[PDB]
Design a protein around this motif. Structure first.
Motif, short mmCIF file in Angstrom:
data_model
loop_
_atom_site.label_atom_id
_atom_site.label_comp_id
_atom_site.label_asym_id
_atom_site.label_seq_id
_atom_site.Cartn_x
_atom_site.Cartn_y
_atom_site.Cartn_z
N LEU A 140 -2.73 2.04 -8.41
CA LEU A 140 -1.77 0.99 -8.13
C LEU A 140 -1.25 1.11 -6.70
O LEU A 140 -1.33 2.15 -6.05
N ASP A 141 -0.76 0.00 -6.20
CA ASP A 141 -0.25 -0.07 -4.85
C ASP A 141 1.13 0.56 -4.80
O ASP A 141 2.00 0.15 -5.57
N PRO A 142 1.37 1.57 -3.97
CA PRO A 142 2.71 2.12 -3.88
C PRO A 142 3.68 1.18 -3.20
O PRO A 142 3.32 0.42 -2.30
N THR A 143 4.93 1.19 -3.66
CA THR A 143 6.01 0.69 -2.82
C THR A 143 6.41 1.87 -1.97
O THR A 143 7.28 2.67 -2.32
N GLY B 156 1.06 4.32 -9.20
CA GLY B 156 0.28 4.82 -10.30
C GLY B 156 -1.02 5.30 -9.70
O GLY B 156 -1.37 4.97 -8.58
N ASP B 157 -1.78 5.99 -10.51
CA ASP B 157 -3.04 6.57 -10.14
C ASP B 157 -3.81 6.50 -11.43
O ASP B 157 -3.46 5.69 -12.29
N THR B 158 -4.92 7.21 -11.54
CA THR B 158 -5.81 7.02 -12.66
C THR B 158 -5.09 7.02 -14.01
O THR B 158 -5.31 6.13 -14.83
N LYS C 178 -2.95 8.06 -2.07
CA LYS C 178 -2.99 9.40 -2.62
C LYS C 178 -2.13 10.39 -1.84
O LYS C 178 -2.44 11.57 -1.82
N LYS C 179 -1.03 9.93 -1.27
CA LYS C 179 -0.20 10.74 -0.40
C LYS C 179 1.25 10.59 -0.78
O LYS C 179 1.75 9.48 -0.85
#
Lengths: 739, 262
Positions: free
Chosen positions: A262-265, A441-443, A495-496
């Motif tokens: 997912l795209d971070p805010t 979100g991530d995997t 991923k940071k």
DNA sequence: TTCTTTTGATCCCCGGGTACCGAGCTCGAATTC
DNA sequence: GAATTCGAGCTCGGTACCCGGGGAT
């Protein structure tokens, strides 16, 4: 034939009691071990060194191999014994001395005694565990030299003898040859300590026991033969057989579609951020949804006599409709398989406290082993031109993973949007007071930014939320669970991120403080900055104030008065980078070679530059997965001429010296590069404060000689450095001066 | 209307549109607006008097705005050559209290039949700096000489290239104005034809010296059409100001190093 | 003569490179107060 | 012609890809 082995340390432990039994030193020529070393050994209780002297290298190596055959150590170890020690010795014993090693294993002849360059080694009836490979996958270090590893694991500042200083020593009498023998023995004592800290044989034997492969295939052959053997056991029970396809068989390209990120805010979030995430996500999908080869149907006829949704799942994977029949029709071999591993995963952890101190250590190495098999199943199906692949199963796993990430996000957004609904589900929210929006979100994870809720009991209710979601949405083996709570989070990029878990530790995730590239100097100062941002209040206030303006307004306005200490660190680092002591071990970059230097297409990399500089000077050429340390030396007319000689403003791949050279020859570092990269690391992290604009961030971080000469030219200042009346009166003086 | 108010309807606005200068600083207050920018390391100014607007009105202490609204656009981009073809009018209305004012810029384009459409897509809003200080020039020069396009073009041709060759605007006795360097030299007469510049206080001889040869780039960017050349030397650091007599009064002060001699 | 395997995908960021492309930015010469 | 227009032609970063590679997740 003239580059000969001179010493072979050989320690002989007992594997069960862990007790060092013999300390042998093979030595070509005289060797009188220094008394200080002998007394350190006797002080620590270790056996006395049995120094064996030889005349010729052949006799020394023959006696070493004779001990290898007679003693027959079931386990051998060492540090880098597969890339240097065994290849050096065997090249001697086969090229030069023409000794058949087929009988020096455990069989009296016709056995395998061979090295491959992972680089393997297969002696028969002898389990070679090189601690170099055991430590590269259990510790993240920039350098994996034995001294750095010894300090970082053992807390043992060892003294290394560099191979350039061994000829000067060996030429002198036996007392310096004894000094060499001491450094040899101490290296092997450190490796024995590493082996008995990690005890690789116990974990790897737990894996070998469970997979069905011998322990050497466990150490060497990879993750697929474990899965293939476990699957083969299951298949042969159920009445299945595994075809060969690979028997006929042999760019950032991918085989199927992975997981959703997912795209971070992006930004500094000072509110609580509950991190849910699925436990054992893809294995739980394989088990929940009964994914296998034996349950897949590409065609909607095989299931034409089964209820839909009740007897079989049907999912569009890769635009191909796929039918995975459910258990109570056929238990997916992969599900059945995983049930056993997943059951052991939780079962062992529960009975670890209910065991002896020794048994607890056993369940440590053993349980950790049962965790490798869980993720190993997913890779097996999605390996193209690997053993028994099925990309329909692997793509189905990831498809359900992406659906679940979004299903969870929509559930959280729909149910708990207002506090009344949150309170209706969990009355314990009443003492915790809003909005609740997934901001990343991530995997499997989702970062829920819980505004209006206190961080105090937010994980205790996050467990209950997670059970609520996992009950409402997903099938039984699947389980979402609240694993963290950040009281502050800096969502940098996909991923940071950095963030301080609740009342606790800093979690740094892929922001180049946790990456083995950089030099300790940049890492040290970057850590100093992030500690300021997170721990030091009045810089978290200023940093959280930076979001009240769009980024470009900070290019004009003075930054909030708290952030000054955040630039004091940078200013200090600028000082510290130019200072002429600059011990260049702080400035040593690394990079992993990771393939033959001919298999690169982009051969203009700094570590390749220095690899060839090392092979040019006949120094120790690195190996395919080594780390190649290097400094960026200053561009100097001589370096320019040398690079064109080996062939402006040079690239950073041509200013790529290695530190040993750059100290020996006192080559000076490239201050320009190292500071531009210090600021680059600062910019990459802290662009999240400034609307993710690396440009603006860079400018504001790089933020006299005009004000000086103006104050000298009788211009008074009007503004900060005077009282408001004084600025007004001077402004009067100017306006009447111009008028 | 709102407290501080600067209106340019047509027919005085045509003079201001007729008058690098985007990433600037706008120091508005009584006596008008001052547009300051730094180009190449020199200080360039563009005064805009309070009488020089269709209506200029000010209440409070002077205010200072960065011109780049949100870091691309500019409060002066309205007054550009052809940015908005059909423009007629601009109003600059300021509304706030002394540490915090904001300025808004509305645009007005001509229509048929005597009316104006407000392009509300491109109005600008800026906030007063909330901390600033600028160092403006002061006093009056020592001796000032008016020049022309060909004159000033050739004197700028005479000046140096880099730090090697410092230049010098000496004025000798009885009309020996000279802008030289080692391998180029130009000269005029000073009257109080084609090398007869006019000026005032011409007796005030000197030989100023510059070490920084950014004058040529600086004054070429602004495309000055010849104007005043003013010398300021009663300071430890002499400075020379240059003020085009074209549509604008855009000025540029250059610092002449302390090596002042006649 | 010399080797002779293994998880998956996603993702940011940097170094080295290229390729527009708007912005300036003066020159150069039709149209001209 | 002397200014004077925007006109046409240079270059000069800027940004973004575009890419491989390191090395995270």
């Amino acid at each position: 034939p003239e580059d000969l082995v001179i010493q072979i340390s050989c320690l002989l432990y007992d594997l069960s009691t862990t007790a060092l039994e013999h300390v042998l030193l093979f030595s070509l020529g005289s060797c009188d071990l220094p008394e200080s070393h002998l007394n350190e050994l006797a002080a620590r209780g270790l056996p006395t060194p049995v120094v064996l002297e030889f005349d010729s290298e052949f006799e020394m190596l023959l006696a070493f191999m004779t001990l290898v055959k007679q003693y027959g150590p079931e386990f051998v170890t060492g540090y880098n014994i597969i890339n240097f020690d065994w290849p050096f010795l065997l090249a001697k014993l086969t090229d030069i001395y023409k000794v058949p090693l087929d009988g020096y294993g455990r069989m009296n002849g016709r056995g395998v005694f061979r090295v491959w360059d992972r680089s393997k080694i297969k002696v028969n009836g002898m389990v070679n565990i090189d601690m170099y490979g055991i430590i590269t996958d259990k510790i993240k270090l920039s350098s994996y030299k034995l001294n750095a590893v010894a300090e970082a694991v053992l807390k043992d500042k060892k003294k290394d003898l560099s191979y350039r200083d061994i000829p000067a020593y060996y030429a002198t009498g036996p007392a310096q040859r004894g000094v060499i023998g001491e450094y040899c023995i101490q290296d092997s004592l450190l490796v024995g300590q590493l082996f008995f800290k990690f005890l690789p044989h116990l974990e790897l034997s737990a894996v070998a026991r469970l997979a069905g492969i011998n322990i050497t295939r466990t150490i060497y052959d990879g993750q697929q033969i474990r899965v293939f053997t476990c699957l083969l056991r299951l298949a042969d029970q159920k009445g299945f057989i595994l075809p060969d396809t690979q028997g006929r068989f042999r760019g950032r390209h991918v085989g199927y579609q992975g997981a959703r990120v997912l795209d971070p805010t992006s930004g500094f979030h000072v509110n609580p951020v509950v991190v849910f995430d699925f436990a054992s996500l893809y294995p739980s999908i394989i088990q929940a949804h009964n994914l296998c080869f034996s349950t897949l149907s590409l065609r909607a006829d095989a299931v034409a006599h089964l209820e839909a949704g009740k007897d079989y799942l049907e999912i569009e994977v890769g635009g191909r409709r796929l039918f995975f029949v459910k258990a109570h029709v056929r238990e997916s071999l992969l599900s059945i398989l995983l049930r056993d591993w997943l059951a052991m995963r939780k079962q062992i952890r529960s009975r670890i406290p209910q065991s002896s101190p020794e048994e607890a250590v056993l369940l440590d190495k053993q349980q950790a082993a049962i965790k490798v098999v869980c993720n190993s199943v997913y890779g097996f199906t999605g390996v193209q031109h690997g053993l028994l692949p099925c990309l329909h199963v692997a793509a189905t796993v990831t498809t359900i993973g992406r659906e679940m990430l979004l299903a969870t996000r929509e559930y959280v957004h729909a149910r708990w949007a207002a506090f009344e609904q949150l309170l209706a589900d969990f009355p314990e929210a009443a003492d915790m007071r809003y909005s609740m929006r997934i901001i990343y979100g991530d995997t499997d994870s989702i970062f829920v930014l819980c505004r209006g809720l206190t961080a105090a009991g937010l994980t205790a209710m996050g467990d209950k939320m997670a059970s609520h979601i996992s009950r409402a949405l997903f099938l039984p083996p699947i389980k979402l669970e609240c694993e963290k709570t950040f009281t502050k989070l800096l969502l940098i990029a996909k991923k940071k991120y950095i963030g301080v878990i609740y009342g606790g530790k800093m979690l740094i995730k892929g922001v180049d403080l946790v990456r083995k590239n950089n030099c300790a100097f940049i890492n040290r100062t970057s850590r100093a900055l992030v500690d300021l941002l997170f721990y030091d209040d009045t810089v978290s206030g200023a940093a959280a104030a930076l979001a009240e303006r769009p980024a470009e307004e900070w290019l004009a306005r003075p930054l909030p008065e708290g952030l000054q200490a955040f630039g004091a660190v940078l200013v200090d680092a600028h000082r510290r980078i130019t200072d002429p002591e600059r011990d260049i071990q702080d400035f040593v970059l690394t990079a992993e070679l990771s393939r033959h230097p001919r298999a690169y297409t982009n051969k203009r990399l700094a570590h390749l530059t220095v690899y060839y500089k090392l092979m040019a000077r006949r120094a120790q050429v690195p190996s395919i997965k080594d780390r190649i340390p290097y400094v960026i030396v200053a561009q100097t007319r001589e370096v320019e001429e040398t690079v064109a000689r080996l062939a402006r403003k040079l690239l950073v791949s041509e200013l790529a010296e290695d530190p040993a050279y750059a100290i020996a020859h006192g080559v000076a570092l490239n201050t320009d590069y190292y500071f531009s990269h210090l600021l680059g690391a600062a910019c990459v992290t802290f662009k999240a404060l400034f609307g993710n604009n690396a440009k603006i961030t860079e400018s504001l971080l790089k933020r006299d000689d005009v004000a000086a000469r103006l104050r000298a030219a009788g211009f008074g200042a009007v503004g900060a450095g005077a009282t408001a009346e004084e600025t007004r009166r001077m402004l009067h003086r100017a306006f009447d001066t111009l008028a | 209307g709102a407290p501080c108010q600067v209106v340019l309807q047509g027919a005085e606005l045509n003079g201001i549109l007729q008058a690098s200068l985007l990433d600037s600083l706008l120091v508005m207050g009584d006596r008008g607006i001052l547009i300051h920018n730094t180009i190449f390391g020199e200080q360039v100014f563009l005064p805009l008097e309070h009488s020089q607007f269709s209506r200029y009105r000010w209440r409070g202490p002077t205010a200072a705005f960065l011109s780049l609204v949100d870091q691309k656009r500019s409060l002066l981009s309205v007054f550009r050559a052809n940015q908005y073809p059909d423009l007629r009018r601009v109003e600059l209305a300021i509304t706030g209290q002394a540490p915090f004012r904001t300025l808004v810029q509305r645009i007005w384009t001509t229509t048929s039949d005597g009316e104006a459409v407000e392009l509300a897509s491109e109005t600008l809003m800026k906030r007063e700096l909330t901390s600033f200080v600028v160092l403006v020039p002061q006093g009056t020069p020592d001796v000032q000489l008016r020049l022309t396009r060909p004159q000033l073009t050739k004197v700028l041709n005479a000046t140096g290239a880099d730090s090697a060759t410092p230049t010098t605007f000496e004025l000798g006795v009885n009309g020996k104005f000279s802008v030289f360097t080692t391998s180029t030299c130009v000269t005029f007469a000073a009257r109080e034809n084609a090398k007869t510049v006019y000026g005032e206080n011409t007796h005030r001889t000197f030989s100023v010296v510059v070490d920084d040869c950014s004058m040529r780039a600086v004054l070429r960017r602004l495309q000055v059409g010849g104007g005043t050349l003013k010398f300021f030397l009663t300071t430890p650091v002499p400075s020379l100001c240059v003020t085009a007599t074209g549509p604008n009064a855009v000025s540029a002060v250059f610092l002449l190093k302390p090596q002042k001699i006649c």
